[PDB]
Each structure stands twice: as structure tokens, then as C-alpha cells.
Design a protein around this ligand. Structure first.
Ligand SMILES: [Zn+2]
Ligand SMILES: [Zn+2]
Ligand SMILES: [Zn+2]
Ligand SMILES: [Zn+2]
Ligand SMILES: [Zn+2]
Ligand SMILES: [Zn+2]
Ligand SMILES: [Zn+2]
Ligand SMILES: [Zn+2]
Lengths: 116, 116
């Protein structure tokens, strides 16, 4: 029921152009629902999402920047986004062609349905 | 001579809207040139930059994403941008209100002068 609500949200992200896949990860935990395309190791993305959350939140605590919102990793052949929404981490893998500004605005509008 | 050229690059970053400061960090872990304000702990930013590079490079190769370009941490009261330009990491601390789109675009334009 709750996992089926997570799935229909990861499907809504598919309309956004540039997205290969996405995943709902528990805070400092494992993957709850996935859409990643298969050439992606899910346990690798999960370990990356918890390592960034731990890195970003500790440094945000000492730099007086407040609470962690989201992280972006731009590589030459793809991008890695990690959104902290409520109790979850939303990892998203994109193309290199994707424009970060439109991409970030499109994800933030669709991920508001994950606030409850 | 070279620290003069480095400092002049960081000063041109001040023209972009929302930039608090920036620093040139060697991938080894030492700050070469810095325009960061007094409230920022520079030893922390250098440790943050080298670890994020370590994680973003280790993940990009295992996920076949190519070479690491830049990493962005969006927080409640600020942003942390880390750009990999050649042998060096360019840390940038900005305001939360700064638009990520026009800031990422102007930054890459001003940081092209770092390739020689
Ligand atoms: Zn795909
Ligand atoms: Zn770490
Ligand atoms: Zn791709
Ligand atoms: Zn609730
Ligand atoms: Zn300032
Ligand atoms: Zn680590
Ligand atoms: Zn600020
Ligand atoms: Zn040269």
C-alpha cells in the first residue's frame, strides 16, 4: 500500500526528460522502491545516498548552514541527485544532456507528493 | 605570481550574485588560495572537498559515469559547490536564495580561466 504509493511517484518522474531511473531509500538505510534501469547497482546507490547524507549533514551542522536538503553529483556521462524529503532519500540518475535548472525544478514539483 | 593569478580568479567569482566566498584546494587537501569569510572554518572546507571528491570519483567509475566534474550540496541556509578543474578543487559557499541555474552557468564560465 505504502510501497505502491512510492512506485507511482517514481513513475511520475519518468515524464521528466533526462531521467534514467530513481529510487526511494530509507534514511541511513536500504532501498524501499526502485526504478533504476538495471546497469545500476542498487546497493551501491544506497551506500552512496547514506554516505552523502552523513557527509552533508555533519558538514552542514558545523558550517551553520542548517539542515540538508539535496545533493547533486555532475559527471561527464550522468548526474546523481539525492533529495532528502521527510523521512526518505530520493536518488535519481540522469543523462549528461539534462539541464540542471529545469531538472531540479521539475523534480521538486513532483516530489512534493512525498510530503506527508 | 601564481597565488596572484589564483586570487584574481577568486575575486572574479565575487561578481556572481549570492557568492559568499571561494577557495582553491589541492586534491591533496591543502588550501592554496582562499577568499572565504572568517566564520567559515577553512580546515573543514578542505576536508569536505577532498572527501566529496573521493566519494564522487569512486562512485562515478563504478557506475561508468566518466570523470567527476562538480558536486553541489544544497542546505537550508546555504550551498556548497565543489568544482574539479584540472589538479585543483574550487570550493564555493553561496546563499540559499541564489538560483542554482544561473549560478552554475556563470561559475563554469569564470572557472575556465583556471585551465592552462
Ligand atoms: Zn534510460
Ligand atoms: Zn565519509
Ligand atoms: Zn545516461
Ligand atoms: Zn505523516
Ligand atoms: Zn557574503
Ligand atoms: Zn567516506
Ligand atoms: Zn549565507
Ligand atoms: Zn599548463
Amino acid at each position: 500500500p505504502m510501497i505502491e504509493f512510492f512506485q507511482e511517484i517514481l513513475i511520475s518522474l519518468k515524464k521528466i526528460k533526462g531521467i534514467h531511473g530513481s529510487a526511494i531509500i530509507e534514511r541511513y538505510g536500504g532501498i524501499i522502491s526502485s526504478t533504476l534501469p538495471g546497469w545500476v547497482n542498487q546497493e551501491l546507490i544506497a551506500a552512496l545516498a547514506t554516505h552523502i547524507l552523513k557527509i552533508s549533514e555533519k558538514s552542514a551542522s558545523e558550517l551553520n548552514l542548517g539542515t540538508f536538503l539535496d545533493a547533486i553529483i555532475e559527471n561527464e556521462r550522468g548526474k546523481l541527485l539525492f533529495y532528502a524529503i521527510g523521512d526518505k532519500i530520493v536518488s535519481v540518475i540522469t543523462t549528461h544532456d539534462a539541464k540542471l535548472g529545469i531538472l531540479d525544478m521539475k523534480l521538486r514539483a513532483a516530489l512534493e507528493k512525498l510530503k506527508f
